[PDB]
Amino acid sequence: LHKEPATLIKAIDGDTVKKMYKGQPMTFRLLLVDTPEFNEKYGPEASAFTKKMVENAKKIEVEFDKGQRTDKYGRGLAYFYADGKMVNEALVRQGLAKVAYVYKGNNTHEQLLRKAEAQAKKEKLNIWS
Ligand SMILES: Cc1cn([C@H]2C[C@H](OP(=O)(O)O)[C@@H](COP(=O)(O)O)O2)c(=O)[nH]c1=O
Ligand SMILES: [Ca+2]
């Protein structure tokens, strides 16, 4: 996979952001994760984590996987990086997202995320408390 520059417009919640992509404003959904909704326990924390991580970064990048780039709802599907650090992985490592929605063909970073999840579970951190 390769990274490319991202033009973010705003973070929406823990696992969705609004991005201009090829000149179209789109919602993008983070691959391989599930954060709580904004009004569920740890929802506000997951939203604030993703929001600060993308806003404080000098450089945001997006990385598509090998399979579909859009979901059935018209959302973009990608991994995001903020100054080189994967947002998808950071959320899982902090126990603010579960590994989820693992589809064959868009699963390149599955093992990396399951490693993070296991560390968060061992630490009984946030969602795993
Ligand atoms: C992460 C992801 C979600 N989705 C779909 C599955 C769920 O659809 P259904 O609602 O039809 O079950 C929905 C979950 O998104 P949210 O977690 O944002 O609600 O988005 C994909 O199709 N591909 C993906 O890679
Ligand atoms: Ca969610």
Q: Relative to the CA of 77, which ligand 1 atom is closest?
A: 25
Output Rg (C-alpha) for the chain, integer angstroms: 14
Whether ligand 1 lies within 6 angstroms of the CB of 77 is answered as yes
CB-based burial label for 122 (10 Å; 0-12, 13-18, 19+): exposed
Please name the method used to determine this structure: X-ray
Domain total of the chain: 1
Is-catalytic flag, 37?
yes
Written as one string, the DSSP assignment of 3-27 is: -EE--EEEEEETTEEEEEETTEEEE
**Resolution limit in angstroms?**
1.5
Q: Note whether 78 and 88 are within 8 A (CB).
A: no
Q: Which domain holds residue 115?
A: 1-129
Is-catalytic flag, 75?
yes
Residues 6+ apart with CB under 8 A from 93: 116, 117, 119, 120
**Which CATH number fits the domain that encloses residue 11?**
2.40.50.90
